[PDB]
Amino acid sequence: PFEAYRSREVAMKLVEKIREEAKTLDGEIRIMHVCGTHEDTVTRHGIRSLLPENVKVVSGPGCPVCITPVEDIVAMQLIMRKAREEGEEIILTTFGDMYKIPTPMGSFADLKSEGFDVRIVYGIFDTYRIAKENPDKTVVHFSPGFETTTAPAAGMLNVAAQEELENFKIYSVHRLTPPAVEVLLKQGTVFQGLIAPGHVSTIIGVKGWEYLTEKYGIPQVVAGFEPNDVLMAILMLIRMYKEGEARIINEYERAVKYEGNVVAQKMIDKFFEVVDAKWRALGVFPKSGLELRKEWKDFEIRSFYKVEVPKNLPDLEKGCRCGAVLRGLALPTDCPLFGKTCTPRHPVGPCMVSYEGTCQIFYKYGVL
Amino acid sequence: PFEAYRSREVAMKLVEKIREEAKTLDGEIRIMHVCGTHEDTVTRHGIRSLLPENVKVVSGPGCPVCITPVEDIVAMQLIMRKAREEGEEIILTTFGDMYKIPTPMGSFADLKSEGFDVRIVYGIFDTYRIAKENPDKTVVHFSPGFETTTAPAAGMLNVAAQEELENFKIYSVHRLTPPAVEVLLKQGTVFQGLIAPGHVSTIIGVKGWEYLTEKYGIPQVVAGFEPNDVLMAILMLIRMYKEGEARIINEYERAVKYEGNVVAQKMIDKFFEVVDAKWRALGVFPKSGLELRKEWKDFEIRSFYKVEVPKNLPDLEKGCRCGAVLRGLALPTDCPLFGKTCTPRHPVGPCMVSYEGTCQIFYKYGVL
Amino acid sequence: CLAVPGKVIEVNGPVAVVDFGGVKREVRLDLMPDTKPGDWVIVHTGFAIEKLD
Amino acid sequence: CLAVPGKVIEVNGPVAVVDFGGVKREVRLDLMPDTKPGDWVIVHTGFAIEKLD
Amino acid sequence: EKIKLEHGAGGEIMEELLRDVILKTLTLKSAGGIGLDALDDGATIPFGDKHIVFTIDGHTVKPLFFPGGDIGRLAVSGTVNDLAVMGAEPIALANSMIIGEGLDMEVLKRVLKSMDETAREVPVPIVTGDTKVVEDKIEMFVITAGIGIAEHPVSDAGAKVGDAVLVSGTIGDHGIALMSHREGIAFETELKSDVAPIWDVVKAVAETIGWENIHAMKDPTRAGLSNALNEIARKSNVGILVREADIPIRPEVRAASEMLGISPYDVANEGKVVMVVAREYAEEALEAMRKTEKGRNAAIIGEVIADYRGKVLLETGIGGKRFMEPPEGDPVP
Amino acid sequence: EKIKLEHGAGGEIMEELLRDVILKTLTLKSAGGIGLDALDDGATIPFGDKHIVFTIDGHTVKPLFFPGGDIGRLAVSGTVNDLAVMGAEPIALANSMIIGEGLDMEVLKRVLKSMDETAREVPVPIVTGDTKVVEDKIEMFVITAGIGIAEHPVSDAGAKVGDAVLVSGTIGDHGIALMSHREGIAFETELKSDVAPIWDVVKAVAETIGWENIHAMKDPTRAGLSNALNEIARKSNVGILVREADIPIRPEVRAASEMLGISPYDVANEGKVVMVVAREYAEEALEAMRKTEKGRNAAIIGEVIADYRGKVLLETGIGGKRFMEPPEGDPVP
Numbered sequence A, B: 001p002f003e004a005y006r007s008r009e010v011a012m013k014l015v016e017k018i019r020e021e022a023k024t025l026d027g028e029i030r031i032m033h034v035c036g037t038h039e040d041t042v043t044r045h046g047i048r049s050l051l052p053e054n055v056k057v058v059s060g061p062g063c064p065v066c067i068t069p070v071e072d073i074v075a076m077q078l079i080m081r082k083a084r085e086e087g088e089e090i091i092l093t094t095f096g097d098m099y100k101i102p103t104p105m106g107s108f109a110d111l112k113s114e115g116f117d118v119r120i121v122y123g124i125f126d127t128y129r130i131a132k133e134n135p136d137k138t139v140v141h142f143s144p145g146f147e148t149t150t151a152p153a154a155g156m157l158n159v160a161a162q163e164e165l166e167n168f169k170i171y172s173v174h175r176l177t178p179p180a181v182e183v184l185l186k187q188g189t190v191f192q193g194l195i196a197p198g199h200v201s202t203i204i205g206v207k208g209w210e211y212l213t214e215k216y217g218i219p220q221v222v223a224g225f226e227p228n229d230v231l232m233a234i235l236m237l238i239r240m241y242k243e244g245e246a247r248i249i250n251e252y253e254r255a256v257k258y259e260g261n262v263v264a265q266k267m268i269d270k271f272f273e274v275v276d277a278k279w280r281a282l283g284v285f286p287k288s289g290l291e292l293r294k295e296w297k298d299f300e301i302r303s304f305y306k307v308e309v310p311k312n313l314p315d316l317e318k319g320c321r322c323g324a325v326l327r328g329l330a331l332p333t334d335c336p337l338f339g340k341t342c343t344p345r346h347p348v349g350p351c352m353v354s355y356e357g358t359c360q361i362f363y364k365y366g367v368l
Numbered sequence C, D: 001c002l003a004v005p006g007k008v009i010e011v012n013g014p015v016a017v018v019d020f021g022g023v024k025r026e027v028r029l030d031l032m033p034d035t036k037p038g039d040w041v042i043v044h045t046g047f048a049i050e051k052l053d
Numbered sequence E, F: 001e002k003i004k005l006e007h008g009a010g011g012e013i014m015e016e017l018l019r020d021v022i023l024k025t026l027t028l029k030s031a032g033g034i035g036l037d038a039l040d041d042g043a044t045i046p047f048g049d050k051h052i053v054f055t056i057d058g059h060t061v062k063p064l065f066f067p068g069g070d071i072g073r074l075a076v077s078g079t080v081n082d083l084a085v086m087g088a089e090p091i092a093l094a095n096s097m098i099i100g101e102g103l104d105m106e107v108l109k110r111v112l113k114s115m116d117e118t119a120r121e122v123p124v125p126i127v128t129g130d131t132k133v134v135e136d137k138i139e140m141f142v143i144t145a146g147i148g149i150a151e152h153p154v155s156d157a158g159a160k161v162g163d164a165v166l167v168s169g170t171i172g173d174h175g176i177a178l179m180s181h182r183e184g185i186a187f188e189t190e191l192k193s194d195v196a197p198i199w200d201v202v203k204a205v206a207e208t209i210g211w212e213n214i215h216a217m218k219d220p221t222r223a224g225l226s227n228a229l230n231e232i233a234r235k236s237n238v239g240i241l242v243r244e245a246d247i248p249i250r251p252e253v254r255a256a257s258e259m260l261g262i263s264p265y266d267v268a269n270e271g272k273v274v275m276v277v278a279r280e281y282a283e284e285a286l287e288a289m290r291k292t293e294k295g296r297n298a299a300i301i302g303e304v305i306a307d308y309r310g311k312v313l314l315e316t317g318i319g320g321k322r323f324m325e326p327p328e329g330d331p332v333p
């Protein structure tokens, strides 16, 4: 069952071809991926220890929970309080990692601590099920996530309107991957090759990433997450660099369609609108976020409450270098807090809290 | 410090005089005391094992918690519920033993179980203190007890009116000792001598018990509670029986005044009115109870609520012989449940629950 | 009616500090106004009911 | 985005029973209507997002 | 059927649970000597010309700190004492702790400090341990197991008719003090616990009259003196006469017990040992005990008799006679 | 400063508590052999031509019953295994139980039944015990202490360069099953715990290659395999190379761990033993293990190396290299 994609022989071969190609390479080639799941593949399998000194793999901002603005997390919290006072208790669902994400004003966990009803769920369906089991209350799901996660949200919003659920709301903090890559391009982040996130591609297909190679000539390679997927993509990128080629190779063709997945596309489009959005520790990226259209404003928990989120909320604790880690400009180990005051159990920054955070992945796997 | 009253020599002497007097006695002399504390003295010190086969000591209904009617306990409970529904939560205080007293509808403990605020206290003052610490709530003390306990209640009712406390109420279930003795006389309970309860005497004095010797010629002896107090009183009674004497000897003169204690007397009289009252497992005794006068009806929790207590509530569980134990006509060991299904930890009847209950005292002390 | 005797060691209005052999407790004197330090009283439910002679 | 693949063993409307090597879980097919038993899908947060070819 | 607070109060009800469930469900209960069925202070295991004494004890005292001691001093004191009443010298301790999520690190440190101070007094080392943390709001539970070597093991069934019964000190200090601390009852001289290891007390007597003359022992902990005596009588099938006037009791203890309405005979002691000795050695044992710092208040309280086998007869102060009933469990004042 | 759930999760954080408080506050920690400081599976006490192994373990697993076993089978399995990895044969068990007021008498009986069935499998008797009851809503806590006799004790510091590393069975069955049971994850064939005593497995190897060739052992319980290995490496000051492709893992375990997002290397095992053996005896040990009912799935996963002393190096399936980091404590899927 796809064993080849995990095959040691297949890997030892790819590693050799890669090595061969780099021996005759000048300078240094830097490949960047933008999906924590890929960073997990790379780090979990020790792929970096198999690469030639002149070939580097850097992790971009491929972690939706990490980049969620603290202003939005605080807002959601200010609304929980704003309801407890209006006598309207709310049931808040969030992902396990997001649940513990820090902000200068506390996490959703510190909230639970204050007696609020915050619940960890694994998907939007869980939230849906909670909205039907608790009719006497309003259930809201702080919804972050890239396209791959936006779709299941849009899909659930279709099954919510038909049923006419009224206690099914969500705080949208969805983000788009492609725009983030283009902002990183215009800002100097160095890399001659891209490893596009397989599953985000499954949704927007190969077509969604083309607009980048055409406008910047950067070779891209949609890849899966098995170890040989990443090794194949590295080889395929090294060669397009050496040959001067600048196109997109769909190495994850077994799961990705050129057009992608139309159902989800429209499903998302029917409910979400692209807008300018802030990325925690990164800045405000143009047309990089998704918010509910005026027609479905009834599903946005912010359409039922107006809170004043204090200004100048710092994005990170002093000493945290998660912003640079997210840009592929810094390694977790470059950080002084890494593995000291900052660990998965007692995290200082968001990169260590998230399951797809680069810092957590490095810590969890003992990078060498 | 009164060591003589506990002196072994003093006792060995009294035991001898008693023995001497009984050797020349015909038939059998039966002395009855009506105070659980005396039964505790007798049983704790093994006095019965020191008495001549023709001299018996029986315990009368000297246990206020035992004789408290189940109708009153149920009522108090029906009022706790009647308030939880009227949105008025009440703070109920009770003595530790009364707290666990059974009724066909549960104890105050089963109530606490249902989330009600029932609190164990050691005296009425505790209740007073709770009424001032909890102004936002009504504090009521289920108040049972003989004169000795009625006084501290009356005294606290004086300090309550002056202060003008409004959340200081009590359910009166106070009882009088003398009347109970006279009812037992008219009903055949056999005994040629009485050992009047020292502390109840301290309140009503020697004068309070005279009306009994004059109307029935029964010799009485107000006694303390040290072992030699009871041994002295037994001797003093055996002799008044043999000599045909019929008077009252105040063996507890060191703590009792002929007139008694006027302060308490008026203190009680100022608030309580003698009325007919029921004695659990004994029947309705005339002018044997005390209820608040119409002027202080504001202190009786029953003046703020009207509950319908179901009729025909059985006084005791099937098999329980606490009624006969209370009459001095039965010993705890005569009971089949005693030490079997009925113990202080899992009591079937009230005589085993109470601290002054004859059954508990027999169990606790391993009678032989 | 445990009725344990104690030696009054402090009187302060309707309140007194009674000593029961190395154990002190506060007692109401409402039913024994004349109470004064040095006295021995019988205490029932936190109240003094009589003095020992 | 754990993205573990499983073999669909039962389809019942927008719900399916996916088998992840001896471990079954129910999955929404809203984004993969064409799904049918025997198929292999990628599951993200309880939803099927694609079929493996 | 539900487990009640009394099923673990060391009295009659707990004995019911042990007889109706524990001993009844377990079938393998011996390693060559005194086993689970004996319900002794510990078990023995023949190992050469010697015997290894094995014992374990759970501690859940609340509050963790109280006048005279703490759950830490108690954990060490209890296990060492259980080994000692078996006639064994403490060799090593095993310490298991189940801590509640949120406990103050300073509390754990303070408890550990006391355990250590207590351990060095024996002396006995804590060679192994375990640490668990639960979300349950429990603060802390200390379970201590201990192994000891006894040349001549002593059991609860060694009592012989004519033997004398001794106690190493005043009865009821731990249990009452902890109770008086609950109800807020104050003092002239604070009433403290007696929790403390008493191996030296046992050793002293044996080193004075020989192990062959120490026919039985037991630290009267849960359920107190009465319980410990009732246990010896039953297992030795002998009768036990105790003279109430010879039982050492502090004035503070008498006073507080009265107000609390509980006999000091039914409450736990954490620094005492009951010893049944050969009639012609009672005085030497008593004096050997009096010569120790923890045995200054020792006293011969009675003798083993042939009548009333399995029961404990009490001769009251005034000369009366009654049984000293083993409590049903935890007192309630 | 407060005690956190991780301070008792068996990982790095707990090691901090032990190093910053427990071992730091206790001063008397040895009885002539391996002591508290060694933090070994148990302690040893020289006693003649032999050594007494002493160990204690607290169990607070929830729920009390789970696929494959219960807190009762676990209590017995854990103590016997800790004695076994020391190279000691189980002699006796001491059982302490802290029961929550209100537990169903049938639950206690069922747990006792399992403890007994498990005990007879060794076989090992439960010679002494203790029973406490608390009002705290805790259900039940089982603390088991055990003593054993080892002719040649084995410690975590015996690993030598060139030695082979073996495991008696699949890794992650207990921890994952209990997790999958929490999230309600169902199965084709129910994923069960592996909780079980494995003295016979250790005995078999020793009885095949001799105790002199078993250089180190450890039951990889809390924090799992990685933790147990990291402990051996540190205390033996050697390096440990493990080949991910040789680590036995059930398909159900892989699948569930993935969905749970937790490595089966960091979760507790209750029926396995890690054994470091002399390079020229690895195959006989492996086969001696394979010949047992609980060791059918044994496998040589690696070797002791001289480089990366105190660390555990993992050679991934594709040939990559990374460290097998000891978890911080309890996993969170």
Ligand code: SF4
Pocket: A319, A320, A321, A322, A323, A325, A332, A335, A336, A337, A338, A339, A342, A343, A347, A348, A349, A350, A351, A352, A353, A359
């Ligand atoms: S380790 Fe922590 S603190 Fe350093 S960047 Fe990564 S999360 Fe920020």
Ligand code: SF4
Pocket: B319, B320, B321, B322, B323, B325, B332, B335, B336, B337, B338, B339, B342, B343, B347, B348, B349, B350, B351, B352, B353, B359
């Ligand atoms: S023992 Fe129980 S049941 Fe028998 S009379 Fe005395 S209380 Fe009633």
Ligand SMILES: [Mg+2]
Pocket: E040, E041, E082, E218, E219, E221
């Ligand atoms: Mg003991």
Ligand SMILES: [Mg+2]
Pocket: E057, E078, E082, E221
């Ligand atoms: Mg003990």
Ligand SMILES: [Mg+2]
Pocket: E040, E041, E085, E086, E154, E155, E156, E216, E217, E218
């Ligand atoms: Mg003994």
Ligand SMILES: [Mg+2]
Pocket: F040, F041, F082, F218, F219, F221
């Ligand atoms: Mg171990």
Ligand SMILES: [Mg+2]
Pocket: F057, F078, F082, F221
């Ligand atoms: Mg262990």
Ligand SMILES: [Mg+2]
Pocket: F040, F041, F085, F086, F154, F155, F156, F216, F217, F218
């Ligand atoms: Mg070991």
